Every structure is written in structure tokens, then in C-alpha cells.
């Protein structure tokens, strides 16, 4: 019955989808994550304590595990109007995040919102939402983008920190290479169809119903880094957007997802 590595999870402008990804995980399952792999010292979605009790839990953990915990943040951080678009216990979330970051052993931005602003920072950006990295300029933030990522993109990052004592290898956006090191289109099983000019033109057409390439439906695989075509989702086999019949939207990738229209064509290298 050894001690487990501590984790503090703070949600900013988050839809909760990134936490929810954990409920689909199988290696580890969320119950084994929290009972065996880590000690989840703060997570407002699951914690028994509320209010003043859960704020006491955070302070006690920040002290007990100073220099030792992994800080995880989902959601963007809104800077407009002095932080008031996300207030918890009467204070701007950016202040909670900066405080928790001071004592962190490692810091992870789970999801596109915390990794690069994501949907919440799109369009006119009503709240001046920014990334975790932007609010922590002095820290190396590990970015695990996707909306939400496959949960094991996160869990295997945490396991590498635990098991081998350092972060996994990262690209120049501080994304783990095992998950984000290649364009989806450079490892997509519909590339033969692309190459042959075999394209779906509309959902339900004959090419679509033969599993042909979705480029002409707006697939963003050519300009999105990720592992969606290989790792896929939910561990049942065969399940990712393109395999189900819908183009990649680029949700991993800044300037693609939530910026380009679904049916807008990608640039191809």
C-alpha cells in the first residue's frame, strides 16, 4: 500500500469534456487512476468536499506536496476585465492557477482550450481567453491538445513522468511526440483513396458509402497533428471521426479547429 503521486486539477473555462475523457479510459480506468495510479488531491467534479472544505483540501495539498504534484488545467483562462469571467471562491481563476503553478513538479494543459485557447478563444474571443502557457510564461507547459484528446494521451504522459521520472519527448509546441508527432494525413488509412482521386463528395453518396477519402468534405487531416487514425478513440477498435464517415475538423490544431469551416478545404503539403 505505497504512497501515490499527487495531482491537482483546476478547471478554468472548461466544458468538462477533458475530465469526461477519463471516464472512457481503460488503461488505467478512472477508478484505478484515482485508487492506484495517483492521488487526485483536488478535482471539483469528483471530490466529496465542497466549498470551504475543498478549499482547505487545496491549500493543505499545495503545502504537503510542494515541489511534487502535477498540476493539470482544462479550459482557457480569460484575461479580459481583470479575470472576472471565471471566479472561484471570489477570486479570478488565473490567480488560483498561478498560485498552484509555483509549487508544481510538472504542469499539463489538457485539451485545446488550455493548450492554445481552443473554442473559447475563437471568433471575437468575448472573454480574452488565452492558453495556460500564456499565463505561465516562466514555466514549461506540456500541451495535450484535442477537444478532448484521447484520455491516454494524458494518462501515458503522466505515467512517463511517474515511471521514468521526466516528461515524454515533446515537439516544438511541447506536445508529446508519441501522440502528436505526425500529421493525421501522413498516417491515415484512406490515403490510398486520396492518392487515387477516390473522394466522397457528399455524405451518403456512393464513394462515402465505400469508405473513400473525405478531403473534399473538408478533412483537416492534412494540417492537423495527432494520433486519431492510429490510437483512435474508446479502445473498441475502428472508431475515429473519419472511420465513422465525417472529416477531421482539426480540433487538435490552432488555426484549424474552430476557425475553418467544416467543409472548407485543408492545405496539403
Amino acid at each position: 500500500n505505497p504512497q501515490r503521486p499527487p495531482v491537482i486539477w483546476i478547471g478554468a473555462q472548461e466544458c468538462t469534456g477533458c475530465t469526461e475523457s477519463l471516464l472512457r479510459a481503460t488503461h488505467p480506468t478512472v477508478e484505478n487512476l484515482v485508487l492506484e495510479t495517483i492521488s487526485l488531491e483536488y478535482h471539483e467534479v469528483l471530490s466529496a468536499a465542497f466549498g470551504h472544505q475543498v478549499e482547505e483540501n487545496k491549500h493543505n495539498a499545495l503545502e504537503k506536496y510542494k515541489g511534487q504534484y502535477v498540476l493539470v488545467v482544462d479550459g482557457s483562462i480569460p484575461l479580459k476585465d481583470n479575470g472576472i469571467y471565471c471566479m472561484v471562491a471570489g477570486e479570478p481563476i488565473v490567480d488560483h492557477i498561478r498560485k498552484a503553478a509555483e509549487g508544481a513538479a510538472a504542469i499539463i494543459a489538457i485539451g485545446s482550450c488550455s493548450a492554445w485557447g481552443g473554442v473559447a478563444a475563437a471568433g471575437v474571443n468575448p472573454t480574452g481567453a488565452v492558453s495556460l502557457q500564456e499565463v505561465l510564461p516562466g514555466k514549461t507547459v506540456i500541451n495535450i491538445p484535442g477537444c478532448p484528446p484521447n484520455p491516454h494521451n494524458f494518462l501515458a504522459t503522466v505515467a512517463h513522468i511517474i515511471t521514468y521520472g521526466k516528461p515524454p519527448k515533446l515537439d516544438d509546441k511541447n506536445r508529446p511526440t508519441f501522440a502528436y508527432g505526425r500529421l493525421i494525413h501522413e498516417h491515415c488509412e484512406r490515403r490510398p483513396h486520396f492518392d487515387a482521386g477516390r473522394f466522397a463528395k457528399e455524405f451518403g453518396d456512393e464513394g462515402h458509402r465505400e469508405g473513400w477519402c473525405l478531403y473534399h468534405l473538408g478533412c483537416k487531416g492534412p494540417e492537423t497533428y495527432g494520433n486519431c487514425s492510429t490510437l483512435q478513440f474508446c479502445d473498441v477498435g475502428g472508431v475515429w471521426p473519419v472511420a465513422i464517415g465525417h472529416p477531421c475538423y482539426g480540433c487538435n490544431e490552432e488555426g484549424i479547429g474552430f476557425h475553418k469551416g467544416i467543409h472548407q478545404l485543408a492545405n496539403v503539403e
Partner: protein, 551 residues
């Protein structure tokens, strides 16, 4: 009085603050506050109508699928598109399987620790615990050996000194009433629930392309390519795989979640007599099965002043009485325009000026239906079905009541459903009835494909001039959802979401009337004002989602 704040309210989705005035240990007045805003309505504006669903689905990842489905329905409403029946079956299976996961997680991972004391579970006799369930459940994982294994996992966690999500919980609070044995039962079921919800989301994933955040919709139908004989598409092998997961849900739902709902009610009978949030209730019909966006499997309607006998049926998502009644006010919200607004003419102009008890105190708007406050969600949904004389709903409620009667010697009347426990019961009934929805719609899909219909998508045209309006209704896990889209010169010129937690959590309205969360708390006993578990019990019964409420 004494003034307390609960901030953050945990074991919800999103960011909630609840304040209460307490007089002599009884809540006299409450305030609900959504404390985070993104402006998702403004973010989606000025785009192609086809793009909205991918963006607004991100209003929430707990109730994933829901905003995606409401958004396409809204565009289809505006454009006058009839969705292919195969697309409806697929949408329906996704929503029902999603909602199964959602409700299970709400009862166990979000709510159970309001009612269940893990310290007490360590004192339980696992054999006595198993024996308590004889003749009450046929579940196969209620043995003393299962319960001992669970007990040992808790023991090990407590012994580690790293309690994590369980640290500083309300163990030994005077409002914790379960015996040790029932606490252990509930913890065992909490862990088992995680497998059932995982199977529910395998259904969702196989049609949606993943979950959270499905990616198989379109304005005009779905992106799934139906071809029984095609490689790499939705063929018989894939459908068989979907069915294998559908079939795994029922036993836990019926023999565990349904049973625990009755068991909790049996030990907490005072919670049948508090937590009434409203006297008016609204639900929309759901699960369309024809070629013209109707013929719903579940009925909708409007109940006024708790009178089921005179309710108004709603059988169409184009019902003009429903559409015309809905308004929202920002009098007590942090937006500029305060008069009630119909959502097609809605604005969302931020005007944060800090907290005031009598002024603005929330990012949630205040919805009304022809000027009245209304509760939405599983209590509304159940009561409307009972008012409709839906036998399936009556029968399912009766099964919960029969277990409760066996444990207590007492029955439950409909009057007692207007309560914190009634709301929880409505949600369980919903989860149970959804398993028949899944069987029904899977069978319908297989049958329809067998007749030679492989159609899934009708390509929209969007006029490049003119201004036109649509609304997409959906009966979400937390209640009636509506997305309101105005298209002008081919792009979105207004977008307004009126979300179920908006109805329930919204602050005092244009007439200073009190909405369901705030109303529900009046009268709540608070044994310990530093640790107001009783307040959180009632709030959690509404299944708050504040990303949803505020967007």
C-alpha cells in the same frame, strides 16, 4: 440571520456558487450564481449555419451530444429540412446511450457522497450487507465477497493517508442516515457503475466517431455511411458490435441503479417533503421516428400549478404555443438588456458589476414560460409522462415504489414527488425507460436497412439573401433544451441557447420571482452552517451543469 457561501459547489459540472441566509438553522433565502462565462453564443455568430453544431457542442462535455443535436435541429428548422428516418434512429441511439451514461454518473459519482458515508462503510459486515438485498435485487455482484473486496479497497485508501477525492468529506455528519451495510452497498455500486457507463459510451462512440464530443452529425442528417456490404463503413458487423454494448446496459440499470434509488429514498424519507423548486413543469417530446421530424417515442407537455389532470400536451417541435412562450431576462444577471427577450431577438451583452444581493449576481439568465418560472428536467419529464398516462412510466415508477414499500411499509403518492427525492426518482425512471428506447431504435434501424433504405443525409441549400429563423428542441438529461438560430444573408446573425440548467439555476427574474434552485432551498435545515450538506443535497438533485446554464 447567518450568511453562508458555498463556492465552489463540487460534484457538478462547472462553476457554481450558492449563498444562503439561515434563520435559526433553517435556510430562509438563497442565491444561485454561475461564476464563469465564455460567450459561446457570440463565438458561433457570423458563421455558416452548417458549422454551428461542432462549435456549440462545446457548450458542455458532460452533456455532450445534446447541443450538437439541438443545433442541427435548429438549422433544419430554419431551412425546412425533413431529416431521413435512418438519421433519426442514429441520433436517437446516441442520445439515449449518452443519457444512460450521464444519469448513472450523476447518481453515483456526482450525488452518492451526499447520502453515503465511506467511514461508516468500513464498519459494515459484508455478509449482512448482501443479505439485506435478498428478494430486493437479482444483481449478480452483490455477494459478501464482492463487498469485502470493495471494503478492503476503501480500508487501503484510508490507511494510505491519501484520501484524495474522499478527503474532508461529510463523514459522521448528523444528516448521514445510512447504516454501515448500506454505505458499503452504495460504494460497491459506485465502482460497478463505472463499467456500465463505459459500455453506454461505447454505443455512443461507435455511431458518433468518439465521445466526448460526437462527430457524426450534419445539418441534413448524419455522416454515418450505411452499407451492409461495405468495407470501412456502417455495415452489419459494426451494427452487431453496437448491439453487443446496448445489451450490456440493462441489468445494472434495473437491478442496481433502480434499486439503490428506492433504498436511498427508504432511509431519507424527510427528503420527500423538501426541495420543491416550482409548481410549473415543461418537457418536450423526444426520439422522433418518422420522416418529418416527429412521431416521438417520449411525450412532452406543460403542467401548471402541479395539476397533472389539466396539463397541456406538446407533440411537435414546431408547436407555436411552446415557441411563443419562451423568454429570458437579465435583470439579476450580468448582462445589459434586462427586459424579457424572446430568443430569436435575444442579446448577450456582458455587464459585470460584481455581486449584489438585490442587483446582479449570476452569469445565468432567467427564463420564463408566458411569464412564469418553470422547472425542467427529469422531474418535469416524469410528471408529464404520468399526466399523459404513459403506462411504461407508471409501471417503472411503481417498481421503485414497490421496493420502497417493502423496505418502509409505506407507498409514495405523486404529491411526494415534488421534492429532492422525487427529482432523483424521475431521473432513474428516465434511465430505465431509455433502455427500451435503445432496443426499439436499434431494431427499427436494422428493419429499415433491410427494406433497402440506406439514406442518411439530405444536402441543404441556404439562400444567400433573406432572413429566416429556426429552433431546435431536445429533451436533454437535465431537461428541455432549445437552440435558436437566425440566418441573414446565408450566415448566423443571431444564436441563442436556452439550456435546461438555465431554467433551473437562473437568478431572480424581471419580476424578482425565484427560480427552482433558489426556491427549492427555502426551508432546508442546516445542522452545521460550516458544512451545509443539506443544501448541496437539494442542489445536486437538479444535476447542475453551469457550462450549460451560462454558455
Amino acid at each position: 440571520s447567518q450568511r453562508i457561501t458555498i463556492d465552489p459547489v463540487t460534484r457538478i459540472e462547472g462553476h457554481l456558487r450558492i449563498d444562503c441566509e439561515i434563520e435559526n438553522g433553517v435556510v430562509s433565502k438563497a442565491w444561485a450564481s454561475g461564476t464563469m462565462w465564455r460567450g459561446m453564443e457570440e463565438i458561433v455568430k457570423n458563421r455558416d449555419p452548417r458549422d454551428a453544431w461542432m462549435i456549440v457542442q462545446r457548450i458542455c462535455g458532460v452533456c455532450t451530444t445534446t447541443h450538437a443535436l439541438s443545433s442541427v435541429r435548429a438549422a433544419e428548422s430554419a431551412l425546412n429540412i425533413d431529416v431521413p428516418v435512418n438519421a433519426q434512429y442514429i441520433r436517437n441511439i446516441i442520445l439515449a446511450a449518452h443519457t444512460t451514461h450521464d444519469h448513472i454518473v450523476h447518481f453515483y459519482q456526482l450525488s452518492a457522497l451526499d447520502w453515503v458515508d465511506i467511514t461508516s462503510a468500513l464498519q459494515a459486515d459484508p455478509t449482512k450487507a448482501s443479505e439485506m438485498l435478498k428478494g430486493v435485487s437479482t444483481w449478480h455482484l452483490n455477494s459478501p465477497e464482492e463487498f469485502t473486496k470493495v471494503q478492503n479497497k476503501i480500508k487501503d485508501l484510508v490507511a494510505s493517508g491519501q484520501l484524495g477525492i474522499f478527503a474532508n468529506g461529510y463523514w459522521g455528519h448528523p444528516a448521514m442516515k445510512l447504516p454501515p451495510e448500506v454505505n458499503l452497498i452504495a460504494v460497491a455500486h459506485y465502482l460497478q457503475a463505472l463499467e456500465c457507463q463505459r459500455d453506454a459510451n461505447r454505443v455512443v462512440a461507435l455511431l458518433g466517431g468518439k465521445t466526448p464530443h460526437i462527430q457524426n452529425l450534419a445539418v441534413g442528417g448524419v455522416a454515418n455511411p450505411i452499407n451492409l456490404d461495405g468495407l470501412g463503413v456502417l455495415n452489419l458487423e459494426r451494427l452487431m458490435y453496437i448491439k453487443s454494448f446496448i445489451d450490456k446496459l440493462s441489468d445494472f440499470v434495473e437491478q442496481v441503479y433502480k434499486v439503490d434509488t428506492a433504498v436511498i429514498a427508504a432511509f431519507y424519507p424527510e427528503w420527500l417533503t423538501r426541495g420543491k423548486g416550482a409548481v410549473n413543469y415543461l418537457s418536450v417530446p423526444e426520439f422522433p421516428t418518422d420522416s418529418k421530424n416527429g412521431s416521438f417515442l417520449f411525450p412532452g407537455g406543460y403542467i401548471e400549478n402541479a395539476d397533472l389532470s389539466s396539463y397541456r400536451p406538446i407533440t411537435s417541435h414546431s408547436d407555436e404555443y411552446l415557441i411563443k412562450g419562451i423568454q429570458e431576462s437579465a435583470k439579476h444577471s450580468w448582462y445589459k438588456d434586462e427586459a424579457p427577450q424572446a430568443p430569436w431577438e435575444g442579446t448577450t451583452i456582458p455587464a459585470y458589476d460584481g455581486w449584489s444581493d438585490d442587483g446582479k449576481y449570476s452569469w445565468v439568465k432567467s427564463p420564463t414560460f408566458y411569464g412564469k418560472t418553470v422547472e425542467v428536467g427529469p422531474l418535469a419529464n416524469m410528471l408529464v409522462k404520468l399526466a399523459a398516462g404513459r403506462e411504461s412510466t407508471q409501471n417503472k415508477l411503481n417498481e421503485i415504489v414497490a421496493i420502497y414499500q417493502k423496505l418502509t411499509g409505506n407507498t409514495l403518492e405523486v404529491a411526494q414527488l415534488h421534492s429532492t427525492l422525487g427529482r432523483i426518482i424521475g431521473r432513474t425512471v428516465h434511465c430505465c425507460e431509455l433502455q427500451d428506447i435503445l432496443q426499439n431504435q436499434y431494431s427499427a434501424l436494422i428493419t429499415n436497412i433491410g427494406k433497402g433504405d440506406h439514406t442518411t443525409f439530405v444536402k441543404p441549400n441556404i439562400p444567400a439573401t433573406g432572413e429566416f429563423k429556426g429552433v431546435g428542441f431536445l429533451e436533454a438529461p437535465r431537461g428541455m433544451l432549445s437552440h435558436w438560430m437566425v440566418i441573414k444573408d446565408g450566415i448566423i446573425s443571431n444564436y441563442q441557447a436556452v439550456v435546461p440548467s438555465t431554467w433551473n439555476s437562473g437568478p431572480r427574474n424581471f419580476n424578482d420571482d425565484v427560480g427552482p434552485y433558489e426556491q427549492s432551498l427555502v426551508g432546508t435545515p442546516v445542522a452545521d452552517p460550516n458544512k451545509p450538506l443539506e443544501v448541496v443535497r437539494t442542489i445536486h438533485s437538479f444535476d447542475p451543469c453551469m457550462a450549460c446554464a451560462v454558455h
